[PDB]
Amino acid sequence: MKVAVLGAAGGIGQALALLLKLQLPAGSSLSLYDVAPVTPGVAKDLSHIPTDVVVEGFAGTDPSEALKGADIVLISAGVARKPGMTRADLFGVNAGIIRSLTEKVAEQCPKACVGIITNPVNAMVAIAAEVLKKAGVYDKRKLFGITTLDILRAETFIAELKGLDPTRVTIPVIGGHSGVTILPLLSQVQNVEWSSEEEIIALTHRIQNAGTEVVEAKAGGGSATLSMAQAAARFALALVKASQGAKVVECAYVEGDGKYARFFAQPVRLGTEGVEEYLTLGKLSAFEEKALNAMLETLQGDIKSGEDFING
Amino acid sequence: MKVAVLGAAGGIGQALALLLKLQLPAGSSLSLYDVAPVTPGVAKDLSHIPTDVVVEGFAGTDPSEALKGADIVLISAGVARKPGMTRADLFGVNAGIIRSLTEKVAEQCPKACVGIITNPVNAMVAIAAEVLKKAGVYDKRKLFGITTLDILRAETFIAELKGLDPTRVTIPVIGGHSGVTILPLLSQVQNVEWSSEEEIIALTHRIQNAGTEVVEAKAGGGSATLSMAQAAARFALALVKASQGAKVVECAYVEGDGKYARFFAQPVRLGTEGVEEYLTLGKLSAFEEKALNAMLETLQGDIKSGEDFING
Ligand SMILES: NC(=O)c1ccc[n+]([C@@H]2O[C@H](COP(=O)([O-])OP(=O)(O)OC[C@H]3O[C@@H](n4cnc5c(N)ncnc54)[C@H](O)[C@@H]3O)[C@@H](O)[C@H]2O)c1
Ligand SMILES: NC(=O)c1ccc[n+]([C@@H]2O[C@H](COP(=O)([O-])OP(=O)(O)OC[C@H]3O[C@@H](n4cnc5c(N)ncnc54)[C@H](O)[C@@H]3O)[C@@H](O)[C@H]2O)c1
């Protein structure tokens, strides 16, 4: 098992690299790549931790050496939202970074699973799909938008509100990865009596807007880095577990059956070659059915913006 | 169990806070304090992780709120060595930070265990001891210089050189926490046939100088942050395990029997009230006995420099 992290010198990159150095299976390797000159030193820092995980670090213009033989590629490269900045600002900075790095994946490790962290995920994942298609290597089973932070948030907020164990709250989160496209299926949550519709609506809002609590409370210091690194590590370790032949189930933004949108976040069962089965959303409340049809235009617009960058 | 991290917004601080948010026992709390205005946002970032660990964050001039009810206080506050900077540069920047923060420990949580990360540890721990003594609350069983990074390095370098499992290499490291004061007892290492004296000397050197490999390879980007956060978390979790009534054994820089120096890094058994027993160094090789007597002057000089800052 070899995992490559592209953007490994950043806030998310460094914490993610630490969690993977601590938690990847003994016998694994970890390669870090970032345009930041510090990157070989980040790898040197991690190499002092006593786990049987070979860690190498690369800066420079060419991630080919980090990517050679990679099974899993995690991309946290690009700028984070600071106060004042819009989705549109992020797209303009990050689209070309995602285009550049996914071209190099197609060249060096086209059979790898690819996990996109870089925002806006909804559009960045469609960019990577179109680059892989232009290279003739696109396997839709192997490309993921990492939405796992929306799951961490949902688990935490449910457990804190309802006095539950946050380690054992399960909650599917479907749709997309931004504002109104995030749909947590609170109707399916166990061991909770909802006060009323009010409580469900307010919890849904808090899950959808949680990034702003952080962006705000850091006050220009940046966005969520440490929670996102945990979310990415959790997803990555799920893919490693699936590579060993485990049944693994995770919410991720994937090119599925296209019932609602070309890309849609849903529970998937992972096998040894990416997605093995696309799982049901299960039973939606009236509230969930309406929220689903209400955000579909935004989600399809996010996808189009990524497709149109690569293809017109 | 409540753990306070002073310096929680820095390179070490943030990664340490993440590992404690992930690993402290369910029912724990974690309070973060730093002079950096971002600190409440670091805590907000971590609060989105689904563990039963209450995380709060404080900036401003007064750590009293973070420290109220603390059982364990970890101090990573102060500047790290960049290229050009000497031990003397660090002492001048960090002495007053350690004096200030330990006065606040004496006021708000005098019965807490205190773990000093801030360098130079050899002198910073004697400063904290003299501040606690001036406040009339010093318990020498409860004050530690965290040397655990020297243990991580020793474990890793032995396992990489000798083809061993780095998760199961045990190596006592004694003396102090800088250059020639670091003494790894390589004579006691199992499952290894030393090529010759040469190999033991070169491995000892690499353990003593490992910080420079990182400071160098980051090239001004800073020193070891991610490995040090793991080392601090390991030590902290050892103290939490001891609080539950476990026999726990760790190398730490402590005011022991003073056979070699007032403060000396040695294996200690932890109980529920800090150090319960000061353990033997065991059998020293000729090489280890000579290296021990050869660095003692430097170590005693490091301690004096801390004592003399507080007392003349
Ligand atoms: N999916 C999610 O839930 C989620 C949540 C939080 C943030 N994010 C996103 O993650 C990204 C990283 O955020 P951060 O806070 O770590 O940012 P950061 O600025 O700290 O780190 C980004 C890193 O990307 C590197 N980078 C830039 N161009 C590169 C290239 N061509 N190749 C390799 N590395 C390159 C930079 O040098 C930097 O080290 C941002 O886009 C942010 O929006 C996603
Ligand atoms: N013991 C070891 O093995 C070991 C190894 C590596 C580094 N270190 C030391 O750890 C320290 C931290 O290193 P780093 O790389 O995280 O540095 P950093 O500069 O990234 O972080 C230091 C933090 O301390 C904060 N701080 C400063 N004064 C403060 C005060 N009065 N109260 C609270 N917070 C305060 C700063 O605002 C900053 O957030 C340095 O002294 C470094 O030498 C120790």
Numbering used by the authors:
A (entry chain A), B (entry chain A): 1 to 312
Task: Show the paper's wording.
Considering that M. succiniciproducens is the most efficient SA producer, it was our surprise to find that MsMDH exhibited the lowest activity among the four MDHs compared. Detailed kinetic analyses of MsMDH elucidated its low activity at pH 5.0–8.0 and its high susceptibility to substrate inhibition suggesting that MsMDH might not be an optimal MDH for enhanced SA production. In particular, MsMDH activity was significantly reduced by substrate inhibition under acidic and neutral pH, showing much lower ki values than CgMDH throughout the entire pH range. On the other hand, CgMDH activity was reduced only to a small degree due to relatively mild substrate inhibition as reflected by its high ki values over the entire pH range. It is notable that substrate inhibition of MsMDH tends to be alleviated with increasing pH, showing a pattern similar to its pH-dependent activity. Noticeable differences in the substrate (OAA or malate) and cofactor (NADH or NAD+) binding sites of MsMDH and CgMDH were found from the conformation of mobile loop36 and the lengths of β7-β8, α2-β2, and α7-α8 connecting loops. Comparative analysis of the OAA and malate binding site (the α7-α8 connecting loop) revealed that Ala224 in MsMDH corresponded to Ser242 in CgMDH. Also, Leu101 in MsMDH, a residue involved in the binding of adenine moiety of NADH, corresponded to Gln117 in CgMDH. Presence of a protruding Gln20 in CgMDH was also observed at the pyrophosphate moiety binding site, whereas MsMDH was found to possess Gly11 instead. All the other variants showed reduced activities compared with their corresponding wild-type MDHs. These results suggested that the replacement of Gly11 in MsMDH with Gln (e.g., Gln20 of CgMDH) endowed MsMDH with high overall catalytic performance observed with CgMDH. The MsMDHG11Q variant developed based on structural analyses exhibited significantly increased kcat and higher ki values compared with its wild type.
The key enzymes involved in SA production were identified to be phosphoenolpyruvate (PEP) carboxykinase (PCKA) that converts PEP to oxaloacetate (OAA) while producing ATP, malate dehydrogenase (MDH) that reduces OAA to malate using NADH as a cofactor, fumarase (FUMC) that converts malate to fumarate, and fumarate reductase (FRD) that reduces fumarate to SA using menaquinol as a cofactor. Among these key enzymes, the NAD+/NADH-dependent MDH was predicted to be important for further engineering as it converts OAA to malate, which is a committed step toward SA biosynthesis. The crystal structures of MsMDH and CgMDH were determined and detailed structural comparison was carried out. The two structures, representing the mitochondrial and cytosolic MDHs, were identified to be quite different from each other with a root-mean-square deviation value of 2.77.
